């Protein structure tokens, strides 16, 4: 090591991503850090609703007898899939909305159950994030052409053992979707926050942004998207009002001169980056420490 620099200041951070100790004079793009308190905003269309609960129960215990071994693999395993019956065939969801719940019934201390993704294209716990399917079926026995999610038993600071698997089969489509849970008293049809960075799932489109009210009066559709595919706005079917969506942290530009940051171009009227003065320019705001008594 010859010398080091700490990526703590504005100028030092710009040197760390530029991977150089000297930054040539010019204009550099940058992005503010995203907040972490992101609320959840959900918009959905009211349709014929029936809710199915896919509940998986995992329970095991050590073989009771003359040997009180604890680190050994469990000997008795009892895995059930709620209303699953082997002779009836796989448990296929046949309603519009559903949720998946994992119930651990093991009482042994330091022992816990878990489920892995395996070769499936989705995780058992993440299906509740508005995932779309044309059909979905769950079974405790092998399903042809499906995928398997391994079930594991874990000991604290000790190696874990496989205790079975869950078999899932699916097809693409928009008839069945997975919702988190029917809480008694939450209007999941239209519950959004405004003027704050929030995570949204609006009409089956997920992203992070800011929602606001625009006077636009488009008559066609309920969802408006850009060429990139990103959602630019949506319409409330009960109101008639159209809301716009903006990214939380749009890029800015920093002016560097003689290894120092002298100004910044901004899209908002904030004295950002510690500058004490801000001026209004024809197509952006400009913030700097300048006194505007210069000519060169």
């Amino acid at each position: 090591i010859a010398n080091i620099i700490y990526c703590n200041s504005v100028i030092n951070r710009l040197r760390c991503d530029q991977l150089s100790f000297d930054v040539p004079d010019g204009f550099y793009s940058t992005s503010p850090i995203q907040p972490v308190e992101l609320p959840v905003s959900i918009v959905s269309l009211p349709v014929y609703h029936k809710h199915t609960f896919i509940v998986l129960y995992v329970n095991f215990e050590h073989r009771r007898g003359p040997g009180k071994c604890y680190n050994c693999r469990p000997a008795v395993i009892n895995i059930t899939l709620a209303n699953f019956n082997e002779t009836k065939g796989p448990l296929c969801v046949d309603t519009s909305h559903f949720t998946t719940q994992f119930v651990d019934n093991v009482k042994l201390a330091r022992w816990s159950a878990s489920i892995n993704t395996g070769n499936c294209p989705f995780s058992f716990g993440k299906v509740n994030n508005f995932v779309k399917f044309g059909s979905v079926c769950f079974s405790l026995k092998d399903i042809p052409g499906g995928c398997a999610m391994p079930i594991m038993a874990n000991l604290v600071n000790s190696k874990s053992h496989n205790i079975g698997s869950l078999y899932v089969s699916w097809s693409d489509g928009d008839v069945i979707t997975g919702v988190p849970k029917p809480v008694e008293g939450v209007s999941s049809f239209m519950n959004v926050t405004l003027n704050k960075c929030t995570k949204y799932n609006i009409y089956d489109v997920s992203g992070v942004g800011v929602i606001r009210i625009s006077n636009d009066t488009f008559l066609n559709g309920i969802t408006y998207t850009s060429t990139s595919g990103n959602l630019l706005g949506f319409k409330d079917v009960t109101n008639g009002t159209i809301y716009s969506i903006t990214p939380c942290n749009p890029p800015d530009q920093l002016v560097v001169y003689q290894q120092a940051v002298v100004g910044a171009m901004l899209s908002e009227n904030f004295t950002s980056y510690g500058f004490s003065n801000v001026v209004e320019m024809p197509k952006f705001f400009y913030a700097s420490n300048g006194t505007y008594n210069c000519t060169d």
Partner: antibody
Amino acid sequence: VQLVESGGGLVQPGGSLRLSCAASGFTFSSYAMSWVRQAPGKGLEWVSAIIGSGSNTYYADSVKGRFTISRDNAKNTLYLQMNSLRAEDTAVYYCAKDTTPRPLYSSGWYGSFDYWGQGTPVSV
Amino acid sequence: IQMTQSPSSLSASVGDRVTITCQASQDITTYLNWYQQKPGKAPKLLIYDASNLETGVPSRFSGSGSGTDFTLTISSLQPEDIATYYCQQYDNLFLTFGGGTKVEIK
């Protein structure tokens, strides 16, 4: 793994009290919390418990209906709502930590507490 | 579920093979843990699952039993062993504590 509580004092019967407990030095969301109090000259009486995700809430028979248990995983804080005080709630309260780590997508058993706090008493 | 700790108090000398038992009134199988309670301090975990020694406790403690009667024995009494003891079951979410015992010095 440090636990510290606050909110003790003297409250008239039937009012309200906002107890609190703070946790640090471990992944807070993976462990179920519990609330327990020791009456003067009595043993330990379980008050309430909360799952790591906060989805399931349990209470004792005397605790049931009077108080609500809540937790905030964004700041590693455990909250309790003392409502409808009686004279028998005069005791010291401890917040405990379960020993079994569980995934946030799973509900599970509890009962083997290993680490406790320091104890904030209340009077009524 | 009711649990009884007996005797509520006993005195012993340094080196005695102290033993304490508590009943459960129900088939708890193996779901019990023991606690250490120094007055003026919060409790600490001694043995879980009725037979496992916690990594933070000296190896001079041992417990065993199955069904409804469970036992906790001390190999030999040391000067810091003087403290309140408690058994607690976790076979049900509405868990209960025992009557509590107060060991004493001789």
